[model samples]
Target chain A: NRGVLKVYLDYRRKNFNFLHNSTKMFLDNLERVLIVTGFPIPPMMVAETDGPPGALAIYRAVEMLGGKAEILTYSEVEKALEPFGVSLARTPEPEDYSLIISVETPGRAADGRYYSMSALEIKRDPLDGIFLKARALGIPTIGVGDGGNEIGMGKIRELVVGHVPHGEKIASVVETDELIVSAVSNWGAYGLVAQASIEVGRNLLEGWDERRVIEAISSAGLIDGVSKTLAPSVDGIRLMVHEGIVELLKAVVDEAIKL
Target chain B: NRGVLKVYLDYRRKNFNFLHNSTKMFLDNLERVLIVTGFPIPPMMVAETDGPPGALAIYRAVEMLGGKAEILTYSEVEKALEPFGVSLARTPEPEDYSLIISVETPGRAADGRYYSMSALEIKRDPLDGIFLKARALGIPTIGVGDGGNEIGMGKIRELVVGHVPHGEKIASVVETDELIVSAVSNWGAYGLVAQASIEVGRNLLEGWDERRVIEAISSAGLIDGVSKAPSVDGIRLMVHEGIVELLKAVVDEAIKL
Candidate 1:
């Protein structure tokens, strides 16, 4: 019943095969994956809590499926993911990975500048350059985002401009080969994993620890994107809500794989 | 400040030449224009008071430009236009008219049924057939509407489905070559006439009486679509007067320049 869910469902209804197609594309090139995350918010200018959890979910799925994964993010996100012993990218090139995925990362707008949801300029180093380079070199790419300012929103720039507040100024001009939009970017990343599980005949998100991961990120000083507080929440939603969504996704995958 | 105006302005920003391009297309095929109107509201099932005035305005503009114009509408609207001595289309053929323009008429939804804004089925003879025929024949057409259920909204059906209420059930599948979406269908018509006057280098909407035309149609028993009273789209008469006055001023200023 969420408005964001309504927008996502409407988009999904229009592009019925979007989740399936993006999952197929991800599975087709899953050897060496580069996951990008970390969106800088205002005031402290630190990365929010939405992206890393989703990026970690994808990274775990890749490793479970015997694929190598690396994360390219800012210093704060790198610190947050340090406990997971995740590989961090240094001077990574588009040609180094078979696939690149952006989850809740800021992308350049038509004005060639990165903006937050409130249309405020983000002063972080441009990570969208790697995505842009991937697109130029004909590399496969997927972007997951909730708000229109994120990397994949460029695929539906007109809808963003017409619907979202401050959309005209914040709508990203960065396009991807496949885009996944959802109520929360973490949910979108989980959906990708769920669909990939259905394709590979195994549940990749099983026993995934949402509470511990979110609590760890919150302890590491990643604030909620909505409340801007160091709570065990993702985008102002409590951890229980995220837990329910993940459990429901796992249940869906289990039922889908049965029979 | 108005929501409808915001939507129209947003649409206009995306399509800069919509009005001008529609005007050019209309003027190019103005030889024997067929203007369509009439939307049957519930309870009374009579034509609403919005369309006839705009249809009459376009009719006057066409006649002023020495082109023959006929209105294809329901019985009440035809009676409303009686004072203006406008011709009524009786078994009209799409091939006969050089251009067909629909103003605020109900177009069929994807379900192949005409619906009111409330999603009620409209029990009336279908007139969109002429428009369908015109499209098949490659005749130029223009549709003016405010609500997503009206004719020509099919050009932006996905937008309608995503934004408007009950849009998925009521969105029109009828599309036109040129569409003019506005806060009011009458404003869209006036916009058309305004752009056409600019192209013709003359203010055709000059001396046009908004109050008189609205009153005449209201007296002829056409109720407002929103208020169900004798007003223009449920708006007060003065607001419509001001809109017309402002549109005329724009025409005058543009022609003067």
Candidate 2:
């Protein structure tokens, strides 16, 4: 235990300083961006409410920027997101999109299974391998994940190995060019939009209807990752906090472009 | 701009959760850890008190973990830190270090100058090149800073450019793998030691004599970056000393837990 303690200290000591427009730069130069979503749950293949709303946020932002955006997910997730007029693709080639972003998508673990943040085994059949193909070809990719089992966890595999339970086996092996670690995958998506709003000198993150969007998406098939119910919450967080973050981000964005 | 209003409604729509044991894993595995510090103020060449003390805290922690640590800094900082028996490193190669870290060292800007947060030239001779070289060699690096011009500023240069004045010109171009942003760079470094102490099951930060360390370093020609006088951490002696007291109290709480 004492030896393990020292190892944790050394690991915690390991720590940044990136590119201009750390994320917005990716969004700005986009011709067409591919957004990946959906972490399959049993029975109905529930795409947690986290991903659809985030994918929708990026979808709308891409359109506002005069570029096309498409969502890549399985048949079930495609249905849940269909109401937003989102274009769906299954097993799309990674080369088609200028930029690829994965939100809340379960990545191939070291053990070859998909996992939730709680380390629960989710699905046997992973969605699309486009992210890995994109990485292999040296195309730009962004992975937004809160937990180590998500696509970009490969970058911080050591952290996952040392921090989480059964981390070594469950940690993802996929790597990406840019990683956005957020409390919720949707927040990372919104952060991209908010950051883009500041870079472009206009707020592009407008018209986000949290309650309406969650209601619409959950009604379609998505469920909360925690509650597993059709409640208007994300990751078991009550709706109010999620509402506060968006409100704060909008004000933050508004205050930025005003200058 | 009215279009901006819809997003702010949704912007209030985000949220956080968890951790203290983030950096503790490496200490047990380190053969030798190199910590880089010392921000030189020109005309006086005083190594501001911000970094050296925190470096000492980490240096002692590494040794207590049965590993080794050497402090890297410019010649001017060597004298300030000598009294603490801190081992000074001179152009030590990164490969020799299993882990390297920086506290308040000015990161190189895109324009190749080292700058203060206010865009003032701190040192014409940037000692931070070692950090950049370390980064180039694929060495893992950590940077702790209060201002956007410090070693880790590159991670959030866009934020600095958007928020800080002269940010575009003064922002650092240097990048590190991880960054700790705090009100005081020392606090960020202290957090590392505290977090490590908690993980290691012992308070490595105990017996931290804030007054003694500051007095010893200041007498050896160190000046506060803000006050431009012999003081602790760019603040008045009383205020800065109180911060150390506050930090030690937090360490006391951490140990009890």
Candidate 3:
């Protein structure tokens, strides 16, 4: 009927009958892209986005250096981005992202604070929602983590949450598309940025000490909700102002024009 | 004078030359003792009168276990035990001790320590002395080392020294004996101890932590001016009293019947 299937249910307490479907979709997406053992640096980058705090900085860093990037919410995951074509952010279908990556999933912290928006139910919020959204759409997803809590942690979340401080209450039930790097999230991105530069034989725009692009991300301010503990206000840093990010973006656009 | 000669020597130096002569006397003294390997406990306990630190330990450890050891030295290398038949410390004639071992010689370190004791020289000392003396007297000699440096460095030292801070300093000059154990001086004694104790199935007196030993050595105040950093008293830790007692205990056990 050219009519799309739709459902309305509360995400945190939602019952999932589509477990196998999301898995299948995620697997299909994985088949298309190249899974690399080392850093992926190329001649040019297209676009970028950020996940909520505690995650997604790694992916965003790769995007900042001229690759395409976008942050998405679980609601947007079902949309698959068919209407928008290829977006750096959330898509309606998994195919919209050649490499769909799940960043931070919400859960408790040692300090007992809920971080991500996801409720982190064993089969619900983090695990069911994120994986089902990707797998149903046949998207490839990767998770990057800083502390022991983020994506891809479901497999060993018990050990992590149990042995690690505040593990049980905050243990995340969700996982990622694939891939994991242990570090503060942003550093992983920085490493990739540095590595991409290394592969090119010259340093890239984002280097160990260069925070210009980071400042640019901060100044654009398209984001809402100035968070603390999760996404802090970032007052003094260049990354805080939306305009700072906008100005550096002009350079990225200028570079793209040459190609 | 060595009444009989028996042993092997690869390099020729005065001390190994001295040890070479002493081996004959050792075998001559213990001709009636039956020696065997795979004996289960004591590898071989024998005794020698005069040699450098490494060789003397080996000789004594081997003799006390059921074998024979001998040596010839200047007068007697340590203090000259006059009452002992072939004591290097108090030899009437240089030949009074069966074997003689000399100590002064320098060699190389892989690094540029020009005067560091040459492993080649140290390695060769026992082999040369033992072989020359032993071959003449009709026996065998072996060299022991903690590291490969003692072999005159030959072709093996560089790859073998590894990346320790002062590893280069340890490489010495010597390669005289036939069979050699690559262990530090005291450890060679350990092996002999293990060997002999196996026959009795008893444990050695000391272990990783030796309280009885450490306490005794300290009480004796036997520690004298141990050579510390070329006459500079305030440098690296030299030697202490406790260690001496431990060594003495090891030697005493090694020499027992």
Candidate 4:
């Protein structure tokens, strides 16, 4: 979370292991670096709370990295963020955090209305208008996502249009400081986490062997797969935390509180 | 259980499977053709008793093609011909089988004797000495094993010496009339089952579309493969009825029987 650094996210999906202690170490290190350098760490969470394992892992990773974080239980987060966390803040008020990030902009149905701007319950995140908001505040923002349609890809959409499978339709609709992709969407978080602390790393595990970065996630889970919406849950992820997945939070709370 | 046929004997480790029904049908149809042509109808299994999936499958297939059969235990058959059953004869009085078909001549150890012939408690089936006896009798043995050292290969100790792995010592010193190299040992049984049944020559199933003949056995359980061992239980039993005689009451057909 740096004044100059903003992170957009999608933390749902299996391999997003932001739970281990090592990941916390990585995020803590990032916070130390930013606070030491006096950069304002932004408050960030999933731009579109899809709840796929990858997306869930992203939010949890962000939490471990010093951002205010939590799963968007159907629409819990949306309710809480709409009015500056007042009456909408159903649960306890989360820790204050800095700026905001919107990594994946929602998409359109066959009809052409912008997805993120559609009637879907919107959260009044600090960086709601994204580029326009950041530009007005003189802040910088970056976009990330694997399938095109993430922000910041305007400059290269032509290449994406030709290269990526569904580029023409999925390419980004808005702009940001930079856009990147390396297969899995989590790779972006991995990059950001690596910069945080090679010691803790995004998974807190990759730091062990670089050659097996992909394999690390692969082997840990005997099962590799995807389920459309958030996999069935009791109380959902926060419950996994209430029950104990905490190291995954430290930084994410920082972002939420600040936001 | 066959003289002028391909018999797959696997006692220690069974590695072949004959697409059962087709083979039985093949034998029946062949015999039928010979009968129609005035060839002598052989006294193969006429008076013998047979049962279960393997034998039943073969029996039914052959019956469909119009052939008679019989099933005999090792004790019921003559002792001189025992190799046909291979090792997995779970019955006692294993030596009584009339003609033990010598198929896979199990490999011997460094000392040029059957390799630790007796190891696992599971290994003490009626198959003991069955191969040796067949080797001694000079039956029309057929060995089907991927590796070089099985029992029947002993026939052309020279050929075995040249082509088999661990060529020098392990190859069975025994000999066989025919040797079939199979991808898997079970393929030996597969060939037998198919050969015994007539349908294989046609090479088509309900599956009119493209297909490789051997593909069915290799298919995953989702598509085909069912039991861990396919068709051999009945085949081996047919060889010497070894399991029934050896285990007797101990081998109950019922659950926990």
lDDT of 1 by residue, A93-190 (tens): 99999999999999999899888887778887888999888999999999999988888778888778877878788889999999988888988999
DockQ score for candidate 2 = 0.01
Off by over 4 Å in 3: A1-69, A73-91, A105-130, A135-138, A177-183, A196-259, B1-257
TM-score of chain B of each: 0.94, 0.85, 0.36, 0.38
Question: Model 4: per-residue lDDT, tens digit, A60-121?
Answer: 44556566443222233333223222121123221222332334443222233232211222
Q: Name the best candidate (by lDDT).
A: 1
RMSD of 1: 21.4
- Give TM-score values for chain A, per-prediction: 0.95, 0.88, 0.44, 0.40
TM-score of each: 0.49, 0.48, 0.27, 0.26
Better of 2 and 4 by lDDT: 2
**C-alpha lDDT of residue B61 in model 2:** 80
lDDT measured at residue A220 in model 2 versus the true structure, 0 to 100: 74
By TM-score, the best candidate is 1
Please, what is the whole-model Cα lDDT of each candidate in the order they appear?
A: 0.85, 0.73, 0.33, 0.32
lDDT of 4 by residue, B1-257 (tens): 21112222332224433333223223323221110000000122111111112222232333344344233223322221122221223332323432233223244433545431112111112232444554466422344444444445554455545544445665455554445544333334334543432222221111211122112221311111112222221243233333222222222221132
Give the lowest summed-lDDT range of ten residues in model 2 chain B.
Answer: B12-21
Ranking by TM-score: 1, 2, 3, 4
Worst lDDT 10-window in candidate 3 chain A: A37-46
Error of 2 at A240 (Å): 40
Residue-wise C-alpha lDDT for candidate 3, range B74-93, written one tens digit per residue: 22222222223332332222
